C-alpha cells in the first residue's frame, strides 16, 4: 500500500508546482503528515508565509 | 531558555513533572507520594522506595484535596526539593485536573503565595495544555490516567466543566483487582514487593490486541499470548490470557467491579451531550491523551472504538501522538515561551488588591 | 625554485609503494611549472622631469609593482629562488620618496612567495591538504587584484597620490604579512596531513583577540579541515576507509587487527592528539566484524565541521566508541559465544571432568607409559576419539578442537622422557575470536594443565600402591604414601577450590560488564598472569624443591619398591630406604615452606592445619 | 509528537549553513501565526475557477492537465485545500502542434498565422535572455570599478 501513497504523493507535487509554490519534496511531506493529523490547512498557509520571511532576516 | 524563563510544575495523582519552561522533557520526574513515616521528610524516589515505613498519599485524587497539609506538604516538597530554584526569579504555572471547583484554585494559590510569596504565577487546566501541543483550539480530549479521567470536550480553547464528564478510574483499582484474580487463581500476594513486580508485569509486559474476541478465542485453546519471563529477583509468574482479561473495564466496566460507565460509553454519551454544531467541530480534531500510552498498542483499540462511535461517511481527521502522558507538560513548555501568554499571567499586585478570586479569571 | 623538482620526485615516489589499488596518479602539465607567466609574481627619463611629474609617474610605477609586473621605469632584477623580490631602481629618486618605496616594496616581497605557493603547492604530490590550503590563499589574490583596479580609476582623474596609496596598503601589508610566514613555514620542510593542520592552529593561540588575523587564519584552517573530514567521515563510521594521497593520521594498508592500520606521528592535527586512540579503536573494532557477516554502519554520522578545538565534533567519536566496540561485544558474545568458549577452555584444561580423564587415562595407559618418540600419532587420535564419546564430555559443541598435542621437550621449551608428561591437549582457538583471546593465552593454560597434571598422577600411583601392598601388620610404606598425598592433595585442594573455582565466577560476570575489548584483555590477563605466578611450577627464585619433589615421589611409588617386588602374596632392607626417603621428603617440605616464608603463605597454614608437626627441626 | 513536526516545517524552510537557536525562536513565529486563525463550494469548483484563469490567458492544454491530475487525486484530502491557497507563494517547440508536414493521419486546417506570430516571440523570448546576460555582467562590475578603494575587500576596512 505503501507505493499507492507514493504515488499519489507525486502527483499531489506537481500540480503544486506548477500553481509554482514554494514548497518542495520534504516541506509537503511535513505538510501532509500535519494535515492528517486534522491541522488546520488555513493556517498553515500563515506559518509558512511568516517562517520563510524571517528566515531571510538571518542570511 | 531563549527569554525570562519561568517554572511548570505538573502536579498529578500518578507522578508529578517539574522543570523549567522552554524544555520538551521535564528536568525532573518524581512519583507523587508524601513524607512523614507511618525519610524523614522526602519526596521522590527514596520515598517511594521506603513506602514500607512510610505512607503513601495523593494530593488530588480525583480533584478534591484529601488533607490541606498533604497537598502543601507535595507542593513544597516539588518547589524545594525536585527543582531546588528562587521563586522571585521564575514564576509558576500551577495545574489542575479538568472539571475542578473555583474554591480548590484559591486555595491552591493561596498555598502558593504564602509558603513561599512568588510575584507572578499561573494557574491553567489540564486539557487545555494537551490541546495546545496539538496546535488547535477545539478537540474533544479523553484524559485516562491512573487516578482521574475525563473526557473533556473543548471549544474556543476554552473547556466548558458543564459538559466534561468526570469518570473515577484509578490504577490503584486495577493493582487491586489484580492482587483479587491473582488470588483466585491461587498465588501468594501479601506484600509490598510483589505488588511492584505486578504493576511492573501490566505496565511493560502486559499486552492489548486490537479484537478482544478473536484473541481471547485463540488464547483460550492454546496460549500464544504468554511469554517466559525470569526476573533477576529469580521468581517465575506468566500468564497471557488473564493480563489481557483484566483492563476490561474499557468495554464491560462490570468486569472491575466498577459502577460507572465504561470509557467508549462515555465519550459516546458525552457526545451525545455535545451541541449539535459543535460535533463535527470537536471531531474535527480529535486526540488519545492519558497515561495509559504507558503500553503502546492499546492506541490502535482506541481509535477503533472512536471510528466504531461518529460515522463513517466523514473522513475522520485524528490526531494520532506517540507519546501522550506528558501532555501538561509540555503544554507549559511551549506555552510560556510565547510572549502571548503573559497578558493571563497574574501578577502579585492582583492577587493582593483584588483577593485570590482572580486568579480564577485572569489565568485559565 | 629547484628544490621543487626534487620534492616532487620523492613525493610520487613514497605515494605509489605505499598502497596497492593501481597507481596512476594524476600529475598537471610540465609548462605551469617551467614558464613564469602561469604564475603571478615577475628607462623612461628622470632627470628632466619635475617634482609634481615625478610623483604623479611615481604613483603609476608603484602601482603597477603592486601586482606581479613592472612598472614604465623600475624594473626587477632576477629572483633565483630568494623569497623577496629585488629591483633595479631608476638613479636620482628622490631621498624622500624612495624610503615610501622601501616601504611599499615589502608589500610585494609578501605578494612573491604567495603566487609561488599557489603555483606549486596545489598538487595531490604535496599532499590533498595543500591542495585546498592554495585554494584558499586563492582567494586573496583576487581582492589583491581588486584593490589594484580600483586605484587606477583614482590615478586617471588626478586623484591618486602617495599618501592614499600609503594609506590603503598598510591593510594589504597587515593580512599579506601573514602570508609571508606561513607560506615559509609550510613549504620549508615537508608538511602532509594532521601536522599543517596543527600548524595552522599554532597562530589560532596567537591571533584570537587581533580580528584582522584571527580571521584569516580561522579562514585558512577552516578550508584545510574539509579533505580531512572526508576520510574521517570513512573511517569512523565504518570499517572500510580510502586513504588516496595519505592525507589522514591512519595510514591505510592492505596487511587485520594488528597488521592493517597504525597511526604516523607526521599526520596528527593537535585537536584530535588526545583522542587519537580512540580513533584508530573505533574503526578497528567496525571493521573486524563486516568480515563475519554483519552490517557496520553506525546511525550517526552526520558531517563534521570546525569549531575551536572544544568537541563539538570530537564528540560524535565518543557516540561512535560507544557504540562500535558494543555491537561488536553483542555480535561476539551471543553468536559463536566466547562465553561458552571460555567455559569449554576451563572443562579440558582445569580438570573440570572426571568421565574424559578417568576414560582416556584407562584405555591409552600402555602408550601413555611409553617414551616419547617411540609413539604412533595415530593410534593416539584413535584412543582419543574412544575416551570423548564414552565419556561425558561428548556434550560440548566445541569438543572438535582438541587436538594430539605431541612435544619431545619436558620444559626444554623453556628458557627420551616419559610420554604421559610428553602429551598434552592443543585446543584451536577460532578466528574470529583469535582477536581477543590467542595462542599466548593457550600456552600459559597448558603450563597450568601440566603443574596439575602432576600432582593427580602421583596420586594415582600411590592409591595403586596402598591398595597392592595390602600387608595387614606392614605400615611403612602407608606413612609415607600418607605424607606425600598430603602435600599433593592440599595443594590442589587449595587451587581450585580457592584460587579459581569462584573468582571464574567473578570473572565470568565482569567481562560481560565490560564495555570494550580493551577491559577484556585487561581482566583476563590479569587473572591468567597471576594464577599461573601463584603455582610451584616456577618463580623468581624457582623453587627447585618441587621438582626433586615429583622425581622422588616416582621414586617411592615404582622405581624402589615395583609393589614390593610381589612379595604381596625384600628383607625389611627395604624399611630402611622407606626411612631414608622419609626423612628427605621432609627436608625438602620444610625447604619449601621456608623458602615462600623469607622471600616477600596458604600451604603452611593448611599442610599445618591444626599445627600437626608444625615443628620438626630448624635451620641453623 | 506533532511539535517536533511543526520544527521540522521550521527546519525545511531555513536552508544550511546561533543557527540551531534562530530555529527554536522562529518556531515562536510559526507557533504565534498558527493561533492567529485559530482565534479569527466544494474542493473541486476551485480547481476550475485557476483552470478558467490559465484557460483566459491562453495554453489550453495545460489547464486540461492540471483537470486530469486532480482528478486521479479525487479518486490526503485537506492537503489541496492548502494547496489551493499558496499560488505564487515562491519564487516570482515540437514539431506536432503547428507543422503539417509531419503525422500520420494529419487533418487539415489551412493556415493559421496568429500562432506563427507568436513564433516570432519564440524568438524574441531567446533574445530577451542573452540581452539579459550582458546587461548583467556590466553592471556586477561597475557596481565594484566604480567606489573608492575598500569596498571590494573587507579586509581593508580593518
Given at each position: 500500500?505503501?507505493?499507492?501513497?507514493?504515488?499519489?504523493?507525486?502527483?499531489?507535487?506537481?500540480?503544486?508546482?506548477?500553481?509554482?509554490?514554494?514548497?518542495?519534496?520534504?516541506?509537503?511531506?511535513?505538510?501532509?503528515?500535519?494535515?492528517?493529523?486534522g491541522?488546520?490547512?488555513?493556517?498553515?498557509?500563515?506559518?509558512?508565509k511568516?517562517?520563510?520571511?524571517?528566515?531571510?532576516?538571518?542570511? | 531558555?531563549?527569554?525570562?524563563?519561568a517554572?511548570?510544575v505538573?502536579?498529578?495523582?500518578?507522578?508529578?513533572?517539574?522543570?523549567?519552561a522552554?524544555?520538551?522533557?521535564?528536568?525532573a520526574?518524581?512519583?507523587?507520594?508524601?513524607?512523614?513515616?507511618?525519610?524523614?521528610?522526602?519526596?521522590?524516589?527514596?520515598?517511594?522506595?521506603?513506602?514500607?515505613?512510610?505512607?503513601?498519599?495523593?494530593?488530588?485524587?480525583?480533584?478534591?484535596?484529601?488533607?490541606?497539609?498533604?497537598?502543601?506538604?507535595?507542593?513544597?516538597?516539588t518547589?524545594?526539593?525536585?527543582?531546588?530554584?528562587?521563586?522571585?526569579?521564575?514564576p509558576?504555572?500551577?495545574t489542575?485536573?479538568?472539571?475542578?471547583?473555583?474554591?480548590?484554585?484559591?486555595?491552591?494559590?493561596?498555598?502558593?503565595?504564602?509558603?513561599?510569596?512568588?510575584?507572578?504565577?499561573?494557574?491553567?487546566?489540564?486539557?487545555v495544555?494537551?490541546?495546545?501541543?496539538?496546535?488547535?483550539?477545539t478537540?474533544?480530549?479523553?484524559?485516562?490516567?491512573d487516578?482521574?479521567?475525563?473526557?473533556?470536550?473543548?471549544?474556543?480553547?476554552?473547556?466548558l466543566?458543564?459538559?466534561?464528564?468526570?469518570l473515577?478510574?484509578?490504577?490503584?483499582?486495577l493493582?487491586?483487582?489484580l492482587?483479587?484474580?491473582?488470588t483466585?487463581?491461587?498465588?501468594?500476594?501479601?506484600?509490598?514487593?510483589?505488588?511492584?513486580?505486578?504493576?511492573?508485569?501490566?505496565?511493560?509486559?502486559?499486552?492489548?490486541a486490537?479484537?478482544?474476541?478473536?484473541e481471547?478465542?485463540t488464547?483460550?485453546?492454546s496460549?500464544?499470548?504468554?511469554?517466559?519471563?525470569?526476573?533477576?529477583?529469580?521468581?517465575?509468574?506468566?500468564?497471557?490470557?488473564?493480563?489481557?482479561?483484566?483492563?476490561?473495564?474499557?468495554?464491560?466496566?462490570?468486569?472491575?467491579?466498577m459502577?460507572?460507565?465504561?470509557?467508549?460509553?462515555?465519550?459516546?454519551?458525552?457526545?451525545?451531550?455535545?451541541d449539535?454544531?459543535?460535533?463535527?467541530?470537536?471531531?474535527?480534531?480529535?486526540?488519545?491523551?492519558?497515561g495509559?500510552?504507558?503500553?503502546?498498542?492499546?492506541?490502535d483499540?482506541?481509535?477503533?472504538?472512536?471510528?466504531?462511535?461518529?460515522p463513517?461517511?466523514?473522513?475522520?481527521?485524528?490526531?494520532?501522538?506517540?507519546?501522550?502522558?506528558?501532555?501538561?507538560?509540555?503544554?507549559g513548555?511551549?506555552?510560556?515561551?510565547?510572549?502571548?501568554?503573559?497578558?493571563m499571567?497574574?501578577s502579585?499586585?492582583?492577587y493582593?488588591e483584588?483577593?485570590?478570586?482572580?486568579?480564577?479569571?485572569?489565568?485559565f | 625554485?629547484?628544490?621543487?623538482?626534487?620534492?616532487?620526485?620523492?613525493?610520487?615516489?613514497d605515494?605509489?609503494?605505499?598502497?596497492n589499488?593501481?597507481?596512476?596518479?594524476?600529475?598537471?602539465?610540465?609548462?605551469?611549472?617551467?614558464?613564469?607567466?602561469?604564475?603571478?609574481?615577475?628607462?623612461?627619463?628622470?632627470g628632466?622631469?619635475?617634482?609634481?611629474?615625478?610623483?604623479?609617474?611615481?604613483?603609476?610605477?608603484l602601482?603597477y609593482?603592486?601586482?606581479?609586473?613592472?612598472?614604465?621605469y623600475?624594473?626587477?632584477q632576477?629572483?633565483?629562488?630568494?623569497?623577496?623580490?629585488?629591483?633595479?631602481?631608476?638613479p636620482?629618486?628622490?631621498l624622500?620618496?624612495?624610503?615610501?618605496?622601501?616601504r611599499?616594496?615589502?608589500?610585494?616581497?609578501?605578494?612573491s612567495?604567495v603566487?609561488?605557493?599557489?603555483?606549486?603547492?596545489?598538487?595531490?604530490?604535496?599532499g590533498?591538504?595543500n591542495?585546498?590550503?592554495?585554494?584558499?590563499?586563492?582567494?586573496?589574490?583576487?581582492?589583491?587584484l581588486?584593490?589594484?583596479?580600483?586605484?587606477?580609476?583614482?590615478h586617471?582623474?588626478?586623484?591618486?597620490?602617495?599618501?592614499?596609496?600609503?594609506?590603503?596598503?598598510?591593510?594589504?601589508?597587515?593580512?599579506?604579512?601573514?602570508?609571508?610566514?606561513?607560506?615559509?613555514?609550510?613549504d620549508?620542510?615537508?608538511?602532509?596531513?594532521?601536522?599543517?593542520?596543527?600548524?595552522?592552529?599554532?597562530?589560532?593561540?596567537?591571533?584570537?583577540?587581533?580580528?584582522?588575523?584571527?580571521?584569516?587564519?580561522?579562514?585558512?584552517t577552516?578550508?584545510?579541515?574539509?579533505?580531512?573530514?572526508?576520510?574521517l567521515?570513512?573511517?569512523?563510521?565504518?570499517?572500510?576507509?580510502?586513504?588516496?594521497y595519505?592525507?589522514?593520521?591512519?595510514?591505510?594498508h592492505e596487511?587485520?587487527?594488528?597488521?592493517?592500520?597504525?597511526?604516523?606521528?607526521?599526520?596528527?592535527?593537535?585537536?584530535?592528539?588526545?583522542?587519537?586512540?580512540?580513533?584508530?579503536?573505533?574503526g578497528?573494532?567496525?571493521?573486524?566484524?563486516?568480515?563475519?557477516?554483519?552490517?557496520?554502519?553506525?546511525?550517526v554520522?552526520?558531517?563534521?565541521?570546525?569549531?575551536?578545538?572544544?568537541?563539538?565534533?570530537?564528540?560524535?567519536?565518543?557516540?561512535?566508541?560507544?557504540?562500535?566496540?558494543?555491537?561488536?561485544?553483542?555480535?561476539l558474545?551471543?553468536?559463536?559465544?566466547?562465553?561458552?568458549?571460555?567455559?569449554?577452555?576451563?572443562?579440558?584444561?582445569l580438570?573440570?571432568?572426571?568421565?574424559?580423564f578417568?576414560?582416556?587415562?584407562?584405555?591409552?595407559?600402555?602408550?601413555?607409559?611409553?617414551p616419547?618418540?617411540?609413539?604412533?600419532?595415530?593410534?593416539?587420535?584413535?584412543?582419543?576419539?574412544?575416551?570423548?564419546?564414552?565419556?561425558?564430555?561428548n556434550?560440548?559443541?566445541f569438543?572438535?578442537?582438541?587436538?594430539?598435542d605431541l612435544?619431545?621437550?619436558?620444559?626444554?621449551?623453556?628458557?627420551?622422557?616419559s610420554?604421559?608428561e610428553?602429551?598434552?591437549?592443543?585446543?584451536?582457538v577460532?578466528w574470529?575470536l583469535?582477536?581477543?583471546?590467542?595462542?599466548?593465552?593457550?600456552?600459559?593454560?597448558?603450563?597450568?594443565?601440566?603443574?596439575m597434571?602432576?600432582?593427580?598422577?602421583?596420586?594415582?600411583?600411590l592409591?595403586?600402591?596402598?591398595?597392592?601392598?595390602?600387608?595387614?601388620?606392614?605400615?611403612?610404606?602407608?606413612?609415607?604414601?600418607?605424607?606425600?598425598?598430603?602435600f599433593?592433595?592440599?595443594?590442589?585442594?587449595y587451587?581450585?577450590?580457592?584460587?579459581?573455582?569462584?573468582?571464574?565466577?567473578?570473572?565470568?560476570?565482569?567481562?560481560?560488564?565490560?564495555?570494550?575489548?580493551?577491559?577484556?584483555?585487561?581482566?583476563?590477563?590479569?587473572?591468567?598472569?597471576?594464577?599461573?605466578?601463584?603455582?610451584?611450577?616456577?618463580?623468581?627464585?624457582?623453587?627447585?624443591?618441587?621438582?626433586?619433589?615429583?622425581?622422588?615421589?616416582?621414586?617411592?611409588?615404582?622405581?624402589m619398591?615395583?609393589?614390593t617386588?610381589?612379595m604381596?602374596?625384600?628383607?625389611?632392607?627395604?624399611?630402611?630406604?622407606?626411612?631414608?626417603?622419609?626423612?628427605?621428603?621432609?627436608?625438602?617440605?620444610?625447604?619449601?615452606?621456608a623458602?615462600?616464608?623469607?622471600?616477600?603463605?596458604?600451604?603452611?597454614?593448611?599442610?599445618?592445619?591444626?599445627?600437626?608437626?608444625?615443628?620438626?627441626?630448624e635451620?641453623? | 509528537?506533532?511539535?517536533?513536526?511543526?520544527?521540522?516545517?521550521?527546519?525545511?524552510?531555513?536552508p544550511?549553513a546561533?543557527?540551531?537557536?534562530?530555529?527554536?525562536?522562529?518556531?515562536?513565529?510559526?507557533?504565534?501565526?498558527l493561533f492567529?486563525?485559530?482565534?479569527?463550494?466544494?474542493?473541486?469548483?476551485?480547481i476550475?475557477?485557476?483552470?478558467?484563469?490559465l484557460?483566459?490567458?491562453?495554453?489550453?492544454?495545460?489547464?486540461?492537465r492540471?483537470?486530469?491530475?486532480?482528478?486521479?487525486?479525487?479518486?490526503?484530502g485537506?492537503?489541496?485545500?492548502?494547496?489551493?491557497?499558496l499560488?505564487?507563494s515562491?519564487?516570482?517547440?515540437?514539431?506536432?502542434?503547428?507543422?503539417?508536414?509531419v503525422?500520420?493521419?494529419?487533418?487539415?486546417?489551412?493556415?493559421?498565422c496568429?500562432?506563427?506570430s507568436?513564433?516570432?516571440?519564440?524568438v524574441?523570448?531567446?533574445?530577451?535572455?542573452?540581452?539579459?546576460?550582458?546587461?548583467?555582467?556590466?553592471?556586477?562590475?561597475?557596481?565594484?570599478?566604480?567606489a573608492?578603494?575598500?569596498?571590494?575587500?573587507?579586509?581593508?576596512?580593518?
Amino acid at each position: 500500500n505503501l507505493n499507492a501513497v507514493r504515488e499519489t504523493m507525486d502527483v499531489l507535487l506537481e500540480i503544486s508546482r506548477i500553481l509554482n509554490t514554494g514548497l518542495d519534496m520534504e516541506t509537503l511531506s511535513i505538510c501532509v503528515r500535519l494535515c492528517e493529523q486534522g491541522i488546520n490547512p488555513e493556517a498553515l498557509s500563515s506559518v509558512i508565509k511568516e517562517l520563510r520571511k524571517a528566515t531571510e532576516a538571518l542570511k | 531558555d531563549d527569554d525570562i524563563a519561568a517554572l511548570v510544575v505538573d502536579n498529578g495523582s500518578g507522578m508529578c513533572k517539574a522543570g523549567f519552561a522552554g524544555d520538551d522533557a521535564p528536568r525532573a520526574v518524581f512519583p507523587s507520594i508524601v513524607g512523614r513515616p507511618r525519610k524523614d521528610s522526602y519526596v521522590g524516589d527514596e520515598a517511594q522506595s521506603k513506602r514500607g515505613i512510610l505512607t503513601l498519599k495523593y494530593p488530588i485524587e480525583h480533584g478534591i484535596v484529601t488533607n490541606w497539609d498533604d497537598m502543601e506538604k507535595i507542593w513544597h516538597h516539588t518547589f524545594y526539593n525536585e527543582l531546588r530554584v528562587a521563586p522571585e526569579e521564575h514564576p509558576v504555572l500551577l495545574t489542575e485536573a479538568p472539571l475542578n471547583p473555583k474554591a480548590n484554585r484559591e486555595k491552591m494559590t493561596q498555598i502558593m503565595f504564602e509558603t513561599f510569596n512568588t510575584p507572578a504565577m499561573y494557574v491553567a487546566i489540564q486539557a487545555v495544555l494537551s490541546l495546545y501541543a496539538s496546535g488547535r483550539t477545539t478537540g474533544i480530549v479523553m484524559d485516562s490516567g491512573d487516578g482521574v479521567t475525563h473526557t473533556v470536550p473543548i471549544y474556543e480553547g476554552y473547556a466548558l466543566p458543564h459538559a466534561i464528564l468526570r469518570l473515577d478510574l484509578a490504577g490503584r483499582d486495577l493493582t487491586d483487582y489484580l492482587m483479587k484474580i491473582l488470588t483466585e487463581r491461587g498465588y501468594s500476594f501479601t506484600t509490598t514487593a510483589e505488588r511492584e513486580i505486578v504493576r511492573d508485569i501490566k505496565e511493560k509486559l502486559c499486552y492489548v490486541a486490537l479484537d478482544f474476541e478473536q484473541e481471547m478465542a485463540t488464547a483460550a485453546s492454546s496460549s500464544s499470548l504468554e511469554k517466559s519471563y525470569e526476573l533477576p529477583d529469580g521468581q517465575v509468574i506468566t500468564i497471557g490470557n488473564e493480563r489481557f482479561r483484566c483492563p476490561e473495564a474499557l468495554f464491560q466496566p462490570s468486569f472491575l467491579g466498577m459502577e460507572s460507565c465504561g470509557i467508549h460509553e462515555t465519550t459516546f454519551n458525552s457526545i451525545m451531550k455535545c451541541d449539535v454544531d459543535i460535533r463535527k467541530d470537536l471531531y474535527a480534531n480529535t486526540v488519545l491523551s492519558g497515561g495509559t500510552t504507558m503500553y503502546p498498542g492499546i492506541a490502535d483499540r482506541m481509535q477503533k472504538e472512536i471510528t466504531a462511535l461518529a460515522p463513517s461517511t466523514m473522513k475522520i481527521k485524528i490526531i494520532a501522538p506517540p507519546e501522550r502522558k506528558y501532555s501538561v507538560w509540555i503544554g507549559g513548555s511551549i506555552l510560556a515561551s510565547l510572549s502571548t501568554f503573559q497578558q493571563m499571567w497574574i501578577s502579585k499586585q492582583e492577587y493582593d488588591e483584588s483577593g485570590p478570586s482572580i486568579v480564577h479569571r485572569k489565568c485559565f | 625554485l629547484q628544490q621543487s623538482l626534487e620534492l616532487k620526485r620523492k613525493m610520487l615516489r613514497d605515494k605509489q609503494n605505499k598502497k596497492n589499488s593501481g597507481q596512476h596518479l594524476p600529475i598537471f602539465p610540465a609548462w605551469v611549472y617551467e614558464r613564469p607567466a602561469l604564475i603571478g609574481d615577475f628607462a623612461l627619463p628622470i632627470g628632466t622631469l619635475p617634482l609634481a611629474s615625478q610623483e604623479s609617474a611615481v604613483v603609476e610605477d608603484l602601482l603597477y609593482v603592486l601586482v606581479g609586473v613592472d612598472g614604465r621605469y623600475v624594473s626587477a632584477q632576477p629572483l633565483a629562488g630568494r623569497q623577496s623580490r629585488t629591483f633595479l631602481v631608476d638613479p636620482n629618486l628622490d631621498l624622500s620618496i624612495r624610503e615610501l618605496v622601501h616601504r611599499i616594496l615589502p608589500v610585494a616581497a609578501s605578494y612573491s612567495a604567495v603566487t609561488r605557493f599557489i603555483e606549486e603547492k596545489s598538487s595531490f604530490e604535496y599532499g590533498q591538504v595543500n591542495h585546498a590550503l592554495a585554494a584558499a590563499m586563492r582567494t586573496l589574490v583576487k581582492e589583491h587584484l581588486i584593490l589594484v583596479s580600483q586605484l587606477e580609476q583614482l590615478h586617471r582623474q588626478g586623484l591618486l597620490s602617495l599618501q592614499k596609496l600609503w594609506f590603503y596598503i598598510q591593510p594589504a601589508m597587515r593580512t599579506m604579512d601573514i602570508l609571508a610566514s606561513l607560506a615559509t613555514s609550510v613549504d620549508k620542510g615537508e608538511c602532509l596531513g594532521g601536522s599543517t593542520l596543527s600548524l595552522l592552529h599554532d597562530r589560532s593561540f596567537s591571533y584570537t583577540g587581533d580580528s584582522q588575523a584571527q580571521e584569516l587564519c580561522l579562514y585558512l584552517t577552516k578550508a584545510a579541515s574539509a579533505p580531512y573530514f572526508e576520510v574521517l567521515e570513512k573511517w569512523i563510521y565504518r570499517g572500510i576507509i580510502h586513504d588516496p594521497y595519505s592525507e589522514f593520521m591512519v595510514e591505510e594498508h592492505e596487511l587485520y587487527w594488528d597488521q592493517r592500520y597504525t597511526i604516523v606521528q607526521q599526520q596528527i592535527p593537535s585537536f584530535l592528539q588526545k583522542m587519537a586512540d580512540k580513533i584508530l579503536s573505533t574503526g578497528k573494532y567496525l571493521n573486524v566484524v563486516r568480515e563475519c557477516g554483519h552490517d557496520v554502519t553506525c546511525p550517526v554520522a552526520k558531517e563534521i565541521i570546525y569549531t575551536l578545538k572544544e568537541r563539538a565534533y570530537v564528540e560524535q567519536i565518543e557516540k561512535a566508541f560507544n557504540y562500535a566496540s558494543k555491537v561488536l561485544l553483542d555480535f561476539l558474545m551471543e553468536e559463536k559465544e566466547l562465553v561458552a568458549h571460555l567455559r569449554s577452555i576451563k572443562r579440558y584444561f582445569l580438570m573440570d571432568q572426571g568421565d574424559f580423564f578417568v576414560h582416556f587415562m584407562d584405555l591409552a595407559e600402555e602408550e601413555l607409559r611409553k617414551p616419547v618418540e617411540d609413539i604412533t600419532p595415530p593410534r593416539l587420535e584413535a584412543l582419543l576419539e574412544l575416551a570423548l564419546r564414552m565419556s561425558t564430555a561428548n556434550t560440548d559443541p566445541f569438543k572438535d578442537d582438541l587436538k594430539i598435542d605431541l612435544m619431545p621437550h619436558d620444559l626444554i621449551t623453556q628458557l627420551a622422557l616419559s610420554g604421559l608428561e610428553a602429551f598434552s591437549f592443543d585446543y584451536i582457538v577460532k578466528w574470529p575470536l583469535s582477536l581477543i583471546i590467542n595462542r599466548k593465552a593457550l600456552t600459559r593454560y597448558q603450563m597450568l594443565f601440566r603443574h596439575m597434571f602432576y600432582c593427580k598422577h602421583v596420586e594415582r600411583q600411590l592409591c595403586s600402591v596402598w591398595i597392592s601392598n595390602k600387608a595387614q601388620w606392614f605400615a611403612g610404606a602407608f606413612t609415607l604414601r600418607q605424607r606425600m598425598l598430603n602435600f599433593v592433595q592440599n595443594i590442589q585442594y587449595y587451587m581450585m577450590f580457592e584460587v579459581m573455582e569462584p573468582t571464574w565466577h567473578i570473572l565470568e560476570k565482569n567481562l560481560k560488564s565490560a564495555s570494550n575489548i580493551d577491559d577484556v584483555l585487561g581482566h583476563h590477563t590479569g587473572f591468567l598472569d597471576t594464577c599461573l605466578k601463584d603455582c610451584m611450577l616456577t618463580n623468581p627464585e624457582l623453587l627447585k624443591v618441587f621438582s626433586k619433589l615429583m622425581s622422588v615421589c616416582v621414586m617411592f611409588t615404582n622405581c624402589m619398591q615395583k609393589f614390593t617386588q610381589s612379595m604381596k602374596l625384600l628383607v625389611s632392607g627395604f624399611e630402611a630406604t622407606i626411612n631414608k626417603f622419609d626423612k628427605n621428603f621432609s627436608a625438602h617440605l620444610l625447604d619449601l615452606l621456608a623458602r615462600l616464608s623469607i622471600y616477600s603463605a596458604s600451604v603452611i597454614s593448611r599442610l599445618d592445619f591444626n599445627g600437626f608437626y608444625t615443628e620438626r627441626l630448624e635451620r641453623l | 509528537s506533532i511539535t517536533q513536526l511543526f520544527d521540522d516545517l521550521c527546519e525545511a524552510l531555513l536552508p544550511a549553513a546561533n543557527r540551531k537557536r534562530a530555529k527554536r525562536s522562529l518556531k515562536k513565529v510559526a507557533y504565534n501565526a498558527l493561533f492567529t486563525n485559530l482565534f479569527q463550494l466544494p474542493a473541486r469548483n476551485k480547481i476550475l475557477m485557476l483552470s478558467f484563469d490559465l484557460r483566459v490567458g491562453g495554453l489550453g492544454p495545460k489547464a486540461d492537465r492540471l483537470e486530469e491530475l486532480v482528478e486521479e487525486l479525487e479518486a490526503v484530502g485537506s492537503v489541496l485545500d492548502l494547496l489551493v491557497q499558496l499560488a505564487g507563494s515562491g519564487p516570482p517547440r515540437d514539431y506536432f502542434l503547428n507543422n503539417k508536414h509531419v503525422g500520420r493521419n494529419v487533418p487539415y486546417s489551412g493556415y493559421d498565422c496568429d500562432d506563427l506570430s507568436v513564433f516570432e516571440m519564440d524568438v524574441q523570448s531567446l533574445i530577451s535572455r542573452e540581452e539579459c546576460l550582458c546587461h548583467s555582467m556590466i553592471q556586477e562590475t561597475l557596481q565594484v570599478m566604480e567606489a573608492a578603494p575598500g569596498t571590494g575587500l573587507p579586509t581593508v576596512g580593518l
